[model samples]
Target: MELKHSISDYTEAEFLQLVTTICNADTSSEEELVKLVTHFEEMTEHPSGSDLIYYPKEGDDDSPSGIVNTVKQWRAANGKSGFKQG
Candidate 1:
């Protein structure tokens, strides 16, 4: 059986090729895909140029009281929760 490779195992070129393959499955849009490929090429050439953001889930509303209680609960639970951020 073939072994599955982790994302980290692929080189930048290989990763970009894989992205193209994925987009090809649905017939990539011309303008959007070109933009995507261009931006990806730039980023692949400079991996550290962009910032990564982690947004909180809907339930994790942003407010003073909510932030305090949520953080307190999170700490009490040792930072374990069924929450996801994008």
Candidate 2:
């Protein structure tokens, strides 16, 4: 079984895979998206400034690449400290 991991415990690649897994869901509503992303945020400790990753702004891409990009952008825009390896 997969053990729970802190946000800091994930590698950049592992984090991306996790994000991809969530983002790639066959969701068609923000409601579903929010519900799914919540788990990721929970797993990652819901760090400061990382909210955008879970709850994106208007025009922010929600696709896999978009979510992945948001992860990188979130770190740079926040402080490059959100993810242990972003």
Candidate 3:
């Protein structure tokens, strides 16, 4: 999730545009959108620059992601089914 850039690499205009692109994705629900916003907020806190992270990588197995397991657990707790959408 880290970008190879110095502290001054990003301008405010570019950063806000990145934020807008992230928030504008077609999320599954309002709660999903809120969850996404929470992670994006974490990305913004990085001292180093980073790419626009939409999905967290699951280290090849593609299950039990640190970033997404909480959301999936929430869905399961609500009696919802889960699938690998890809």
> How accurate locally, in lDDT, is each candidate?
0.34, 0.56, 0.38
Model 1 lDDT per residue over 2-86, tens place: 4223323334344434344423433355555444334432332322211110123456643322322333343246533212221
lDDT of 2 by residue, 1-86 (tens): 45455445555566666666566655666656565466556544435223535466677775555665666565566554455654
Better of 1 and 3 by TM-score: 3
Model 2 deviation from native, Cα RMSD in Å: 4.7
* C-alpha TM-score for every candidate: 0.26, 0.50, 0.28
- Clashing residue pairs, candidate 3? none
Give the best candidate by TM-score.
2
- Mark the regions of model 1 whose C-alpha exceeds 4 Å error after superposition: 1-3, 26-86
Q: Put down candidate 3 lDDT per residue, 16-84, tens digits, no spaces.
A: 333444445446765655554554344334321122344434453222133233333433565433322
Highest lDDT model number: 2
Q: Single out the weakest 10-residue window by summed lDDT for candidate 3.
A: 43-52
Q: Per-residue lDDT for 13 in model 2? A: 68
